[PDB]
């Protein structure tokens with residue numbers, strides 16, 4: 001739908017058989033979620049943010065239903081304050097900025 | 100205009116008599132810019148991001164021309180990797196998410 005920026009742009013994702021909410025982030029190149037159980041293998045990886053650098057697990061080819069749309073990409077799991085859906089997934093569900 | 104998410108959503112702001120580019124961030128509640136000279140008074144403030152917490156200067160009532168639109172808000176100046184225009188300013192220039 002159309003979403004104004006008066007409140008945090010929050011959205012219900014379904015991931016790895018579980019329900020969660022997550023922040024729509026056009027600032028973010030990648031998708032990062034707080035600590036949660038996911039099947040398969042991962043790779044130790046590191047990202048940077050405002051504060052500094054954090055160390056994540058990389059899962060690839062993880063199916064996510066964002067507000068009822070399908071998408072499949074790399075999801076980084078770690079020590080984030082917020083659930084970030086960035087641009088790798090944003091493009092799939094067909095998202096844009098209008099102003 | 101309309102902006103796809105295939106590349107980082109970068110935009111030319113004019114601030115404190117200078118030109119710079121900055122990242123359109125719907126994830127960000129506030130606007131934070133790297134270290135630069137601004138007139139007036141400020142307050143020592145602290146924010147959090149992925150990585151951790153950083154310490155900023157707060158300037159209030161700073162006029163910014165984002166892609167040729169006027170806006171006046173709180174701008175936090177500090178040690179960010181990127182120039183962030185978040186939601187405090189986003190709303191002013193009339194921004195939305197469409198998907």
Ligand SMILES: CC(C)[C@@H](c1ccc(Br)cc1)c1c(O)c2ccccc2oc1=O
Pocket residue numbers: 025027028029048049050051082084122124126127128129130131146147148149150180181183185
């Ligand atoms: C929730 C964060 C992940 C997010 C954020 C940004 C500003 C503020 Br105030 C609060 C949060 C965030 C990015 O969207 C980001 C984008 C590009 C580069 C670095 C980045 O660091 C970040 O912390």
